[PDB]
Structure formats: structure tokens, C-alpha cells
Design an enzyme around this catalytic site. Structure first.
Site, short mmCIF file in Angstrom:
data_model
loop_
_atom_site.label_atom_id
_atom_site.label_comp_id
_atom_site.label_asym_id
_atom_site.label_seq_id
_atom_site.Cartn_x
_atom_site.Cartn_y
_atom_site.Cartn_z
N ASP A 39 0.81 -1.25 -0.04
CA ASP A 39 -0.04 -0.12 0.03
C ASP A 39 0.97 1.23 -0.03
O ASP A 39 1.95 1.37 -0.72
CB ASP A 39 -0.92 -0.07 1.33
CG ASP A 39 -2.12 0.61 0.90
OD1 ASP A 39 -2.13 2.06 1.00
OD2 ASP A 39 -3.22 0.05 1.01
N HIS A 69 -3.47 5.99 4.24
CA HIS A 69 -4.25 5.00 3.65
C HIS A 69 -3.53 3.61 3.95
O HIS A 69 -4.19 2.95 4.68
CB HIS A 69 -4.26 5.09 2.22
CG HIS A 69 -5.05 3.88 1.39
ND1 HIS A 69 -6.56 3.90 1.34
CD2 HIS A 69 -4.62 2.75 1.04
CE1 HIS A 69 -7.03 2.86 0.85
NE2 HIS A 69 -5.83 2.17 0.60
N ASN A 161 -14.37 -0.32 -5.65
CA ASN A 161 -15.29 0.77 -5.18
C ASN A 161 -16.17 1.39 -6.22
O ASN A 161 -16.54 2.55 -6.27
CB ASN A 161 -14.79 1.73 -4.38
CG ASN A 161 -13.89 1.22 -3.01
OD1 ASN A 161 -14.03 0.26 -2.55
ND2 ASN A 161 -12.54 1.82 -2.88
N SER A 224 -11.14 -1.24 0.36
CA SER A 224 -9.76 -1.04 1.20
C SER A 224 -9.83 -1.18 2.71
O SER A 224 -8.86 -1.70 3.40
CB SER A 224 -9.33 0.42 0.88
OG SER A 224 -7.91 0.45 0.92
#
Ligand SMILES: [Ca+2]
Length: 279
Positions: A39, A69, A161, A224
Site C-alpha cells: 500500500d 491509507h 469501489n 480497502s
């Protein structure tokens, strides 16, 4: 063990029903397992990680998480307050820049890194990888995810998403890894969650409180956020001896809460990750 007033997602993962706020888990807590968070990186110095987080790789000028994130995802995997597996080792691999972007080529390299790198880590109970990222279908991306998994790593990936069929996204569409959709605290499919035959499981993804950079915390939403719940769950279950990297996705699907989610499209699994812990 019982953690009162836990984030709703932790509570949900140890519950047969929505609407509770205590998280229940075996105290082994994923000890002796490892989770790679692939990530934006991890702020390892966050008190919530207690020395159990480390940056092992970056493809950029720094290994720091300048976004937050990756740090959020890692916190959901294994932070003391916001984590599923509160005693796991967390390894950060920075394939995404501080804007949360990454070329497919760097992402692939990161996946192949972990597959080798687990051989340099101490993880007697098993290895998990959490990939809360994705883009359009790429056979090369899917293939790299499939290698990571074949190498002996439980691979968990975000469905995406787009409120769309995840067959058109990578690594979400790779059959051999665990593709994770998002749900909310009322057991609705999250409005943004992708769906489709390629999904394996759902985890909590809406309004998810976890760690952030600058040693803080915040609530954010996405597949996520759902992904690290399932990655952390696999790590926890692996330390309990219930499953292995190769069978953990199946095992999780097998022991899931079934038929409980609303707005699941016809043909998509109605399964919510659940640790089946009997306190
Ligand atoms: Ca899959």
C-alpha cells in the site's frame, strides 16, 4: 478476550448479529503470524503498533507513509485498539505513492517481493498479504497475485469501489486469491462495493475507525477497509491452527455468516467474515 467499545467492524467480525460493540477473540491474537500491507506504507512509529510494524520495502524516495491509507489498513489488520490480529507482525511494502497511486509494474514487483521476502521473516504460524488497491483488468497483475498466493501467502484483495462487477478489475478478478467486498454496520452491502462471481467474502468497509499518519486516527470507507479485516482474520485463524495460507479464504467462506447481508446482487456470495469465536 473481550474488547469493549471496539470499532463496529471488529465487533461484527466476532458476532452472529449486527448491532453489538464488543470484540471477542482468542488471546493468541495472531501471534507468530505475519501480514504484509502492500500500500502507501505504514507509520511504524504509531503507538498503536507497539513495535510490531516495520517498513520492509519501498519503490519510492521514501518508505514513509505520506498518505495515511496504508497506515489505516495496517491498523485494521493488527493495531492494538483497531486491529483484528492484535499480536501479528506487520510488514509494509510501499507500492503506492503519497497520492495513493502506483504503476501496475511497481505493484507487480511488490507482490513478487513479498513472495520472496517471507523467506527472510519469522512467521511460524503463516503469512498473509493485504492488497487494498486495484485498477482495470490486467492479466499480468492477476498473475502476480496468483504467484504470491501459490508461494504460500494468504492473499486478500479489495473488490474495488465502483459499485460494479469486479471481474473487470485487478487483482480483484484473480480466481486464486481472496476478493473482499465491503459491508456497513446495518449489514447492507456498502453502496460503493463491487460485486460479482469473483468475490469470495465481505468484511466491514463503511465508517471504519483505524490508525492514521501523524500518530492519529480517523474513520474512512472502502473495500480497502474491508480487505484488512479479512487479512487480519486469516492471520488470527492461522495462529489458532484452524487453517493455512492455501485454504484460509475457503475456510473463511465456509465459517462465514451466511445470507445476512442486504443488497447483494443475484450471483454474488452472501457471506460476511466471522471468526466463530466462542468466548
Ligand atoms: Ca477471487
Amino acid at each position: 478476550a473481550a474488547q469493549t467499545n471496539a470499532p463496529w467492524g471488529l465487533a461484527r467480525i466476532s458476532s452472529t448479529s449486527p448491532g453489538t460493540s464488543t470484540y471477542y477473540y482468542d488471546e493468541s491474537a495472531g501471534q507468530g503470524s505475519c501480514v504484509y500491507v502492500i500500500d502507501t506504507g505504514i507509520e511504524a512509529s504509531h503507538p498503536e503498533f507497539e513495535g510490531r510494524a516495520q517498513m520492509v520495502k519501498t519503490y519510492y524516495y521514501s518508505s514513509r507513509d505520506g498518505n495515511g491509507h496504508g497506515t489505516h489498513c495496517a491498523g485494521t489488520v493488527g493495531s492494538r485498539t483497531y486491529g483484528v490480529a492484535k499480536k501479528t507482525q506487520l510488514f509494509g511494502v510501499k507500492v503506492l505513492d503519497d497520492n495513493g497511486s502506483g504503476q501496475y509494474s511497481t505493484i507487480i514487483a511488490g507482490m513478487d517481493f513479498v513472495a520472496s521476502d517471507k523467506n527472510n521473516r519469522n512467521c511460524p504460524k503463516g503469512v498473509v498479504a493485504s492488497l487494498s488497491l486495484g485498477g482495470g483488468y490486467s492479466s499480468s497483475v492477476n498473475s502476480a497475485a496468483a504467484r504470491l498466493q501459490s508461494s504460500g501467502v494468504m492473499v486478500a484483495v479489495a473488490a474495488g469501489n465502483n459499485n460494479a462487477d469486479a471481474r473487470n478489475y485487478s487483482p480483484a478478478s484473480e480466481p486464486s486469491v481472496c476478493t473482499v467486498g465491503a459491508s456497513d454496520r446495518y449489514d447492507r452491502r456498502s453502496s460503493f462495493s463491487n460485486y460479482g462471481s469473483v468475490l469470495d467474502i465481505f468484511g466491514p468497509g463503511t465508517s471504519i475507525l483505524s490508525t492514521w499518519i501523524g500518530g492519529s486516527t480517523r474513520s474512512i470507507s472502502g473495500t480497502s477497509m474491508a480487505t484488512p479485516h479479512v487479512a487480519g482474520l486469516a492471520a488470527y485463524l492461522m495462529t489458532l491452527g484452524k487453517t493455512t495460507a492455501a485454504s484460509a479464504c475457503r475456510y473463511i467462506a465456509d465459517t462465514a455468516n451466511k445470507g445476512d447481508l442486504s443488497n447483494i446482487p443475484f450471483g454474488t456470495v452472501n457471506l460476511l467474515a466471522y471468526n466463530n469465536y466462542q468466548a
